[PDB]
Amino acid sequence: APKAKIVLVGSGMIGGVMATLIVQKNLGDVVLFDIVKNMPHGKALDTSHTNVMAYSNCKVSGSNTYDDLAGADVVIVTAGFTRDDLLPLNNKIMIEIGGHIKKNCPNAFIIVVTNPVDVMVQLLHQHSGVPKNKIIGLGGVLDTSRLKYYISQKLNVCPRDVNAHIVGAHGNKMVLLKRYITVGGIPLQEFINNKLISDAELEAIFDRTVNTALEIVNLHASPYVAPAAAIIEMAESYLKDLKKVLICSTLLEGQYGHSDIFGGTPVVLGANGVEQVIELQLNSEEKAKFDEAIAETKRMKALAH
Amino acid sequence: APKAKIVLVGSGMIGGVMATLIVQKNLGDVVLFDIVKNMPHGKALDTSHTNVMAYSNCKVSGSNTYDDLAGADVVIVTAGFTRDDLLPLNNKIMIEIGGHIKKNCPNAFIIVVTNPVDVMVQLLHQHSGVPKNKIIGLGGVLDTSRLKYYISQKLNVCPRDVNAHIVGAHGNKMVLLKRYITVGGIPLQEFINNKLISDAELEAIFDRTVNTALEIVNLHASPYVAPAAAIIEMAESYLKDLKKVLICSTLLEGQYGHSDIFGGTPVVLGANGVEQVIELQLNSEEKAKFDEAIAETKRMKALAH
Amino acid sequence: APKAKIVLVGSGMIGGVMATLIVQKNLGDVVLFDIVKNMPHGKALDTSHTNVMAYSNCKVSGSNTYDDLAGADVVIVTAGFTRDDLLPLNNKIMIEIGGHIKKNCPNAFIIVVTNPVDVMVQLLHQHSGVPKNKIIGLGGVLDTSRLKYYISQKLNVCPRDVNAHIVGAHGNKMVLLKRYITVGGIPLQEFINNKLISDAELEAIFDRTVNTALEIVNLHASPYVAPAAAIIEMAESYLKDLKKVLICSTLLEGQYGHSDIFGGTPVVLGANGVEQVIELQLNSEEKAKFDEAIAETKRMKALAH
Amino acid sequence: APKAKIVLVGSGMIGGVMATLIVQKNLGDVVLFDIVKNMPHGKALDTSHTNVMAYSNCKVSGSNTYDDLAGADVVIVTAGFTRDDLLPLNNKIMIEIGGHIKKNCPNAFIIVVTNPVDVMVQLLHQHSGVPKNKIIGLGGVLDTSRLKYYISQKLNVCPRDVNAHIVGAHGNKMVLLKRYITVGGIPLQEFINNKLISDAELEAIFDRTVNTALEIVNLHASPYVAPAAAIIEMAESYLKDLKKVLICSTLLEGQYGHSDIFGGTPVVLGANGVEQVIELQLNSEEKAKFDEAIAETKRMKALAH
Ligand SMILES: NC(=O)c1ccc[n+]([C@@H]2O[C@H](COP(=O)([O-])OP(=O)(O)OC[C@H]3O[C@@H](n4cnc5c(N)ncnc54)[C@H](O)[C@@H]3O)[C@@H](O)[C@H]2O)c1
Ligand SMILES: NC(=O)c1ccc[n+]([C@@H]2O[C@H](COP(=O)([O-])OP(=O)(O)OC[C@H]3O[C@@H](n4cnc5c(N)ncnc54)[C@H](O)[C@@H]3O)[C@@H](O)[C@H]2O)c1
Ligand SMILES: NC(=O)c1ccc[n+]([C@@H]2O[C@H](COP(=O)([O-])OP(=O)(O)OC[C@H]3O[C@@H](n4cnc5c(N)ncnc54)[C@H](O)[C@@H]3O)[C@@H](O)[C@H]2O)c1
Ligand SMILES: NC(=O)c1ccc[n+]([C@@H]2O[C@H](COP(=O)([O-])OP(=O)(O)OC[C@H]3O[C@@H](n4cnc5c(N)ncnc54)[C@H](O)[C@@H]3O)[C@@H](O)[C@H]2O)c1
Ligand SMILES: O=C(O)c1cc2cc(O)ccc2cc1O
Ligand SMILES: O=C(O)c1cc2cc(O)ccc2cc1O
Ligand SMILES: O=C(O)c1cc2cc(O)ccc2cc1O
Ligand SMILES: O=C(O)c1cc2cc(O)ccc2cc1O
């Protein structure tokens, strides 16, 4: 069928949730690839059955064979471990995967999740050989969903009606742009002026946003459901040609004064992949912060070769 | 059942589309009320069957009996004709309807569509006797969907990723705020600066937006599908408690310097109805325009008593 | 984009509803083709805007140019008038349309609605030249939605949980198979035995089902919303590769003892179009009825050449 | 808000998936209750953020406090361990939970998942004190989704277009009724007669269906995504008043010749909970099998008091 083939190179936690969500939305056939034997076949089996409950018809199969990447339309990479000691190592994993992407599905759209994602996405870009508009890393969508949500719960408005922008990198050096936050299209400042939300609050929310994954870990859980949903938001925008403005890690070719590196910025995802890279007209203050994010990305890139 | 009862006081064009959309989304039971005999029963019959195709269970019935308003949770008024000669006349229709709302379903949430809507919504507010937070008029959501769409098609981005604000009134005196237009959360000016969209273009789009209903009429059609979808967006936000920021006609109690009148402004619709009235921090220029819109509303209010 | 192009050859009542539903479900781009000047552009304009309310990105345009059929992936024909005097005439319309389909979009999937549909679908099959698995007529899905719904409202169960089969023809000679009606997978007889629904009731429902369009007309309405939803159910099954079992008019090649004619029967719609034609193992009694339906189809076929 | 409060007494694997699905469908607010400290707060945090990606507004919070059950509209119990040694023990857990349900939310709708579910559901029925129509156990929906899916993949039709019935018990003594399997409303026998599917195949599928959870476990996974989706299908039918025919564990009051026990049978879930208990008109052969299922349920009931 013209049905899209979506291969998940990594069938761990994020892997189960995406499979679940893809059937829920009838986005395409799913391959849960992993190097752990059998488990993917297991998850795939359990997942396959939801087709019934969902009025869906998406094949879900497992795989311990790289060559199942053949004909993949979308590929989503979560494979890897989890310090700077793991870098040369997740780098070896990206290198192996890109080899197989180039061999089996060079025209696939690629989304990288493996952390640190702005480093790792570039690594795979170079080894897979795909065009720059055909590969992005997860980051911005997830990070902003936290900023958007926290604010929405203070202002008692629909979460999606908060817009925000986080750029530069995923991780600790991510840049929260207080200047680009709106509520129902309206500048956030207006709501600060009305004493509906204070600057002190909003600063507590910013640190909360930056520290979320960590907050989740210390509560004896692990962040994987949000990551999943955001990845799928991006994937769906590719498959359905929605042209959503979504913040992802992508190849900078002069934006923000930066080149020959991947960094977080709003892009437009549609049928051609990255159809636009939107550059925010940052002031020097917010550009200084962007610079620190790109510098930490370069630093971990060197630690892996 | 706790299933909501949605009564459509008016089963003409907008009336058929809402019924269709409500079943599509399983929002509630529908009553197509009209004074035209039988027709509502007809539309209701045809509509009822889509329950099958939609995996839905919403009763859809017709009605030539006002007292079918009893127990309505939501009421949506499109009844009326279509000059200032029709005002004292659509006023007599609002007067009759409010009487029945007060008698049969005083705790209903009310949405007025009948034009001119900012006049007519106030008229019904006073005669039905419902609380100020339980009644709004259609206007802003529809008008902005046109502004949002036209821009989206120039910038090649997802329509919903355009946000805009139109206030003051529905109709010719509606106020387009160029200052409050964003794309993927980003100020529109940034995209003007990049020569992706020009000021001359955007001005052509503004006049297009203001003249749409008229453009549709001269193409030998009539605007009713968009009106329908927007009304339902508002209704759904009420029923589901979504707290969406939506621009509707509502009772001004000092905002924009205006009182004892209905005018278009972003509100938050949830379970309590109008849960917030958001006042835009307009400059004098945009406030002068707001004033002209409120003045035309007052002027047609007088022509009906 | 890989986004599907859906052309509606006929932009009247059924035409507006499908456009509406297609955007609602982000199924594809829509062309409202009609021979009436401008009107399609009008409907398309109004419809285009719902993209915003729906989180959708489907182009909707009008057309008075047959050659806009070029590259269409799906084509849905509602064009025509509405006696046996109109046959040689709607036949001339199918002949003109097939010419353009063969010229501009020979690989399109085709759905015929124009009545009488089992005659008219064959007419277009022969003049367009498309493969037998790439063209069906609306009938069964619509007719059964009425049978399913009426029963569901007596048994107080979800409408979709009623299954039924109507075959042979759309129209008065349609064959209701009482033997193939189930509720939640369970034979209807079981519910007759329990005195939850009587044979006399169910017979009243059968005549109701057969006479619905007529019942709708005498209530001063016209049946177009259900037709729309069912057409879209079929179209969606094609586009999404859902392999739904849906009753449509299709080319009989020996089933039910019939050949070289179109008649209503369950088929499976997926990516290859008609992927299976399911033949019901009818007893002689129900086959006698099938025969009368095919005979009326042949009879009106002759009246048009 | 009238927004429903859905409390998940158990925030393990099935627990994360339901939370995910409930936000996806904007079904209500979610409380992830568990006795494990913090973890529920963690999962809830991660989950809460998907509100953004989903256009949703469902609160998701954690809880280590039973009294958070207060005002719950729906309660879904997955708490417990996993031999007949664990019975008197999961029994002590049901006893504690029912105490809190009776105290805090006696009018809640209850769905039991804890295994063995037909035993455990009755246990909670007696200790919570809720009406018989307000409590069911998961079983039939999940089990049939496997039977439906496997068959659908042989016949190449949409999964949901297979209907089947499994009754009596969840677990090894579950009764597969070959006689009540249909495809697109049509008896399965017809498809056996056509040599599209054989009896030997279908028997392999039956044993597959019975052994699925076990098949999933030996592939180094655990069955939790399907269980989740089915539970939510049931919950959604309650909340939305869909009147779906769904097979669940419920109180038998003479059906199948059985009393004063819970067993699997098609029911109709709507606003009143269990609105109907449908009794299948089983022959003696299939009733003998039903009897063995009820006997194993009674046997494990005794092992817990
Ligand atoms: N970019 C982001 O916003 C973001 C957010 C959260 C997590 N993450 C990252 O995503 C990754 C995974 O998250 P998770 O929670 O699913 O982890 P997980 O450990 O549950 O899954 C990783 C899977 O990859 C497998 N694996 C190892 N080598 C492989 C290979 N060559 N091919 C296929 N699979 C291989 C593992 O066995 C495991 O199943 C991590 O690196 C994490 O840091 C990124
Ligand atoms: N506010 C907005 O953004 C907006 C947009 C478009 C249209 N409109 C307005 O909505 C109204 C209707 O639009 P439509 O296209 O559905 O019109 P329509 O003529 O097709 O429907 C109006 C219906 O009301 C009926 N009616 C008259 N008196 C009635 C009564 N007392 N009770 C019930 N029904 C009664 C008519 O018979 C008719 O069926 C008009 O006044 C129009 O100006 C408003
Ligand atoms: N098969 C079914 O189950 C079923 C059910 C209901 C209605 N119908 C049939 O569908 C058809 C239309 O239904 P409707 O309610 O949309 O009717 P409608 O009159 O509102 O629409 C028909 C449209 O076709 C146009 N037309 C005429 N010649 C044309 C051409 N060459 N190209 C494009 N358009 C042309 C007309 O101007 C009109 O806009 C009728 O023939 C009716 O009998 C079929
Ligand atoms: N009926 C069915 O069709 C079906 C299908 C699959 C699984 N199950 C059953 O569902 C149950 C759980 O499945 P899972 O995969 O989510 O298991 P899980 O172990 O991941 O979750 C069970 C949770 O309950 C907790 N718990 C223990 N006592 C508790 C209490 N008093 N209150 C709240 N939580 C408590 C545990 O800490 C754990 O988080 C099992 O008993 C299993 O056998 C039933
Ligand atoms: O959830 C996150 O945001 C996140 C972020 C990061 C960043 C990073 O650099 C390593 C690992 C993780 C793991 C995570 O789960
Ligand atoms: O579609 C519209 O925007 C619109 C607006 C107005 C305004 C008005 O004042 C009268 C009638 C209409 C009718 C309409 O259809
Ligand atoms: O709605 C229907 O079922 C229907 C059926 C038929 C059958 C027919 O033969 C001509 C016209 C119509 C028009 C219709 O609207
Ligand atoms: O998935 C199932 O069907 C299932 C069934 C059963 C039955 C049972 O008796 C105990 C535990 C389980 C666990 C499970 O996961």
> Rounded to whole angstroms, how far apart are CA atoms C259 and C262?
8
Calculate how close chain D gets to B286, using CA atoms only, in Å.
31
Distance of alpha carbon D230 from the chain centroid = 6
Q: How many CB atoms lie within 10 A of CB D83?
A: 6
Helix (H) or strand (E) holding A85: none
C122 and C25, same domain (yes or no): yes
Q: Is residue D150 helix, strand or coil?
A: helix
CB proximity C223 to A under 8 Å: no
User: Counting atoms of ligand 4 from 1, which one is nearest the CA of D137?
Assistant: 1
Q: Give the nearest partner residue to D184 out of C186, C266, C275, using CB atoms.
A: C266
CB proximity A21 to D under 8 Å: yes
DSSP B62-81: EES-GGGGTT-SEEEE--S-
Strand partners, B247: B266
**CA–centroid distance, residue C249 to ligand 3 (Å):** 17
Q: Do D46 and A229 touch (CB under 8 A)?
A: no
Pairing mode, strands B60-63 and B29-33: parallel
Residue burial A217-227, b: 16+ Cβ < 10 Å; e: rest: eebebbbbbbb
Q: Do C157 and D244 touch (CB under 8 A)?
A: yes
User: Counting atoms of ligand 7 from 1, which one is nearest the CA of C143?
Assistant: 3
D170 and D298, same domain (yes or no): yes
Six token digits for residue C145: 């939605």
Six token digits for residue B43: 């539309």
Calculate how close chain D gets to B56, using CA atoms only, in Å.
7
Q: Which of D115, D137, D159 is the last residue of a domain?
A: D137
CB proximity B165 to C under 8 Å: no
Is residue C170 flagged as an active site residue? yes
Q: Is residue B219 within 8 Å of residue C38, measured between CB atoms? A: yes
Angle at D256 between CA D254 and CA D257, to 5 degrees: 50
- The number of residues in chain A equals 305
Mutate to test the interface with D, among B25, B57, B246, B275 (most CBs of D within 10 A): B57
A176 and A271, same domain (yes or no): yes
D169 and D284, same domain (yes or no): yes
For ligand 3, atom 41, which residue shows the shortest CA distance?
C114
CA distances in angstroms from D141 to B193, D75, D146, listed in the order given = 57, 18, 9
Q: Is residue A72 within 8 Å of residue A6, measured between CB atoms? A: yes
Six token digits for residue C123: 């007419």
Closest to C124 measured CA to CA, from C66, C68, C174, C77: C77
C251 and C106, same domain (yes or no): no
> Rounded to whole angstroms, how far apart are CA atoms A77 and D269?
41
Six token digits for residue C263: 């008649």
Pairing mode, strands A109-112 and C109-112: unpaired
For ligand 5, atom 12, which residue shows the shortest CA distance?
A115
> Rounded to whole angstroms, how far apart are CA atoms D50 and D42?
14
Q: Which class for C62: exposed (0-12), middle (13-18), buried (19 or more C-beta within 10 A)? A: buried
Q: Is residue C137 within 8 Å of residue B40, measured between CB atoms? A: no
Helix (H) or strand (E) holding C289: helix C284-302
Range of the domain at C176: 138-305
Q: Which of A137, A158, A176 is the last residue of a domain?
A: A137
Q: Is the peptide bond between B223 and the residue preceding it cis, with omega within 30 degrees of 0?
A: no
**CA–centroid distance, residue C105 to ligand 7 (Å):** 28
Mutate to test the interface with D, among A46, A183, A246 (most CBs of D within 10 A): A46
> Rounded to whole angstroms, how far apart are CA atoms B210 and B202?
12
Q: Is the CB of A116 inside a 6 Å radius of any atom of ligand 5? A: yes
Q: Which of C83, C113, C137 is the last residue of a domain?
A: C137
Beta strands in C87-144 (DSSP E): 109-112, 135-137
CA distances in angstroms from D95 to A196, B11, D40, D120, D126, listed in the order given = 46, 54, 22, 10, 9
Residue with tokens 């076949």: A41
Q: Is residue C46 helix, strand or coil?
A: helix
Six token digits for residue B94: 């609002």
> Rounded to whole angstroms, how far apart are CA atoms D239 and D242?
8
A155 and A115, same domain (yes or no): no
Q: Which B residues in the span 90-119 are in contact with C, Cβ-Cβ below 8 Å?
A: none
B36 and B102, same domain (yes or no): yes
Pairing mode, strands A74-77 and A109-112: parallel
Residues 6+ apart with CB under 8 A from C214: none
User: In this structure, what CATH number is given to the domain that contains residue C248?
Assistant: 3.90.110.10
A68 and A191, same domain (yes or no): no
The radius of gyration computed from the CA coordinates of chain A, to the nearest angstrom, equals 19
User: What is the Cβ-side half-sphere exposure of residue C146, based on CA atoms within 13 angstroms?
Assistant: 28
Six token digits for residue B139: 């206007």
Work out whether the CA dihedral A153, D229, D86, D127 comes out positive or negative.
Answer: positive
Calculate how close chain C gets to A233, using CA atoms only, in Å.
12
User: In this structure, what CATH number is given to the domain that contains residue A125?
Assistant: 3.40.50.720
Pairing mode, strands C166-167 and C175-176: antiparallel
**CA–centroid distance, residue C170 to ligand 7 (Å):** 8
**Strands, sheet with A186-187, edge to edge from the N-terminal-most edge strand:** A162-163, A182-183, A186-187
Residues 6+ apart with CB under 8 A from C150: C205, C208, C209
Task: Give partners of C (≥3 CB pairs < 8 A).
Answer: A, B, D
Q: Do C39 and B224 touch (CB under 8 A)?
A: no
The residue from B170, B220, B258, B305 that is catalytic is: B170
For ligand 8, atom 11, which residue shows the shortest CA distance?
D115
> Rounded to whole angstroms, how far apart are CA atoms A217 and A213?
6
Work out whether the CA dihedral C205, C206, C211, C213 comes out positive or negative.
Answer: positive
Q: Is the peptide bond between A266 and the residue preceding it cis, with omega within 30 degrees of 0?
A: no
Work out whether the CA dihedral D255, D256, D261, D267 comes out positive or negative.
Answer: negative
Helices (H), B161-198: 188-193
Under 8 Å CB pairs connecting chains B and D tally to: 28
Q: Is residue A243 within 8 Å of residue A269, measured between CB atoms? A: yes
> Rounded to whole angstroms, how far apart are CA atoms C43 and C25?
18
Q: Do B16 and C225 touch (CB under 8 A)?
A: yes
CA distances in angstroms from B124 to B250, B304, D125, D244, listed in the order given = 12, 13, 50, 40
Helix (H) or strand (E) holding D229: helix D225-240
A167 and A305, same domain (yes or no): yes
Give the count of domains, chain A.
2
**CA–centroid distance, residue A80 to ligand 1 (Å):** 5
Q: Which C residues in the span 22-51 are in contact with A, Cβ-Cβ below 8 Å?
A: 26
User: What is the Cβ-side half-sphere exposure of residue C50, based on CA atoms within 13 angstroms?
Assistant: 30
Pairing mode, strands C244-253 and C259-270: antiparallel
> Rounded to whole angstroms, how far apart are CA atoms B32 and B10?
7
Q: Is the CB of A270 inside a 6 Å radius of any atom of ligand 5? A: no
B277 and B172, same domain (yes or no): yes
Q: Is residue D190 within 8 Å of residue D106, measured between CB atoms? A: no
> Rounded to whole angstroms, how far apart are CA atoms A226 and A224?
6
What are the backbone dihedrals phi and psi of residue D204, each rounded to the nearest 5 degrees, phi first? -65, -40
Q: Is residue C278 helix, strand or coil?
A: coil
Q: Is residue D232 within 8 Å of residue C146, measured between CB atoms? A: no
Q: Which residues of A are annotated as a binding site for NAD(+)?
A: 13-138
Helix (H) or strand (E) holding A247: strand A244-253
C124 and C145, same domain (yes or no): no
Positions of D marked catalytic: 170
CA distances in angstroms from A179 to A49, A140, A166, A272, D111, listed in the order given = 46, 16, 11, 30, 47
Q: How many CB atoms lie within 10 A of CB D7?
A: 27
Given resolution (angstroms): 2.7
Q: How many CB atoms lie within 10 A of CB D195?
A: 7
Identify the experimental approach: X-ray
The counts of H helices and E strands in chain A are: 11, 14
DSSP code for A168 = B
User: Counting atoms of ligand 1 from 1, which one is nearest the CA of A114?
Assistant: 41
Residue with tokens 């009906």: B304
DSSP D84-107: TTSHHHHHHHHHHHHHHHHHH-TT
Name every chain B residue with its beta carbon within 8 A of the beta carbon of D28.
none
Task: Give partners of D (≥3 CB pairs < 8 A).
Answer: A, B, C
Rounded-to-10 torsion of CA A245, A246, A249, A255: 30
Work out whether the CA dihedral D289, D292, D294, D300 comes out positive or negative.
Answer: negative
CB proximity D82 to C under 8 Å: no
Give helix D13-24 / helix A13-24 axis angle, nearest 10°: 40
User: What is the Cβ-side half-sphere exposure of residue A19, based on CA atoms within 13 angstroms?
Assistant: 34
Closest CA in chain A for residue D220: A39
B11 and B99, same domain (yes or no): yes
Closest CA in chain A for residue B240: A158
Name every chain A residue with its beta carbon within 8 A of the beta carbon of D145.
49-50, 52-53
Strand partners, B8: B32, B76
User: Counting atoms of ligand 3 from 1, which one is nearest the CA of C96?
Assistant: 31
> Rounded to whole angstroms, how far apart are CA atoms C179 and C199?
12
Q: Do B26 and D240 touch (CB under 8 A)?
A: yes
Beta strands in chain D (DSSP E): 5-9, 29-33, 60-63, 74-77, 109-112, 135-137, 162-163, 166-167, 175-176, 182-183, 186-187, 244-253, 259-270, 273-277
Six token digits for residue A251: 């190849």
CA distances in angstroms from A88 to A80, A82, B221, C112, C286, listed in the order given = 11, 12, 64, 60, 72
Q: Give the nearest partner residue to B51 out of C54, C141, C159, using CB atoms.
A: C159
Calculate how close chain B gets to C228, using CA atoms only, in Å.
9
CA distances in angstroms from D17 to A19, A47, D97, D230, listed in the order given = 12, 11, 21, 11
CA distances in angstroms from A41 to A47, A76, D150, D156, listed in the order given = 10, 18, 15, 21
Q: Give the nearest partner residue to A158 out of B190, B243, B281, using CB atoms.
A: B243
Is position D126 annotated in a ligand binding site?
yes
Give helix D39-48 / helix A225-240 axis angle, nearest 10°: 20
Q: Do A45 and D230 touch (CB under 8 A)?
A: no
